[PDB]
């Protein structure tokens with residue numbers, strides 16, 4: 843199957859997660875294209891994949907990264923019925939609205955018809971060894987749900 847991952851990372855923590863998850867998936871007989879939101883992908887590309895993984899830190903007052911806002915708006919005009927999807931991100935418990943970018947992106951995927959196949963994966967700040975193992979489990983479980 844043909845998969846896309848679109849991630850946002852300012853200080854590298856969500857990027858580390860993305861690279862682990864994608865590297866695990868690449869060891870299966872599935873293709874994955876990993877795109878940084880800073881490179882401005884158009885949301886319509888999500889219609890052309892079998893599975894979709896989004897990664898995002900949380901910003902401001904429980905908000906999406908600024909660089910995700912246009913893409914998020916454009917998601918209201920795409921049809922993701924049938925696709926399999928999941929979301930991850932780095933988080934900080936010094937904020938009350940912890941990791942809610944993950945929850946916001948899950949909600950939008952649901953509204954557009956995607957089958958969200960995993961709970962949101964939230965890691966505090968920089969992954970430690972156990973968090974990297976959770977990234978492995980997330981990639982492995984995502985693949986199981988494909989066909």
Ligand SMILES: Cc1cc2nc3c(=O)[nH]c(=O)nc-3n(C[C@H](O)[C@H](O)[C@H](O)COP(=O)(O)O)c2cc1C
Nearest residue numbers: 851852853854855856899900901902904934937941
């Ligand atoms: C201005 C600012 C606002 C933030 N807002 C939140 C927030 O509401 N909730 C949260 O969990 N983290 C929040 N964070 C923490 C970041 O999500 C956290 O540092 C994360 O590890 C960044 O991931 P990254 O390294 O991929 O950029 C905020 C950080 C900054 C600088």
Ligand SMILES: OC[C@H]1O[C@H](O)[C@H](O)[C@@H](O)[C@@H]1O
Nearest residue numbers: 917918919920921953954955
């Ligand atoms: O693409 C726009 C339309 O897509 C789907 O029909 C949604 O269910 C509907 O709410 C939205 O207005």
